[PDB]
Amino acid sequence: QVQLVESGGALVQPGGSLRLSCAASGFPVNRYSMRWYRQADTNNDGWIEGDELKEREWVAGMSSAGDRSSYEDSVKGRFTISRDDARNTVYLQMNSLKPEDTAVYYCNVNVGFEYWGQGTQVTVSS
């Protein structure tokens, strides 16, 4: 069936870089637009909990043909979305990471229903 599996989350120092992956099963990533979302840690405790789990912040997206990408303002220039069609995987490159980027990151596709993966956490902290 349709499945999305995020990986690559880690603890990173401020200013650091990371690449997240979203491995898709059940459909081809080069036939669907794919998006990254996050649920951020808004109370600076290093956890995503409670009302933080009721949020839906769009981070980045790329079109099915691969020729149109978009980013939320707060990450423009710092993050880059790409994909590897052979690995059926979408990536999110992060640079110049900030504490405000601490969040669980989720990839998303619409295959006749709206689907999100189980998420991977990035923590930006000292």
Site residues (vs Tb ion, CB under 5 A): 41, 43, 45, 47
Residue (51 or 73) nearer to Tb ion, CB? 51
* Diameter over CA atoms, the chain: 42
Phi and psi at residue 91, to the nearest 5° = -120, 155
Task: Name the minimum Å distance from CB 48 to Tb ion.
Answer: 6
Q: Which residue is nearest to Tb ion (CB)?
A: 41
Nearest to 92 by CA among 102, 104, 105, 101: 105
CB atoms within 10 A of CB 17: 11
Residue (47 or 58) nearer to Tb ion, CB? 47
Task: Name the minimum Å distance from CB 123 to Tb ion.
Answer: 11
Task: Name the minimum Å distance from CB 109 to Tb ion.
Answer: 27
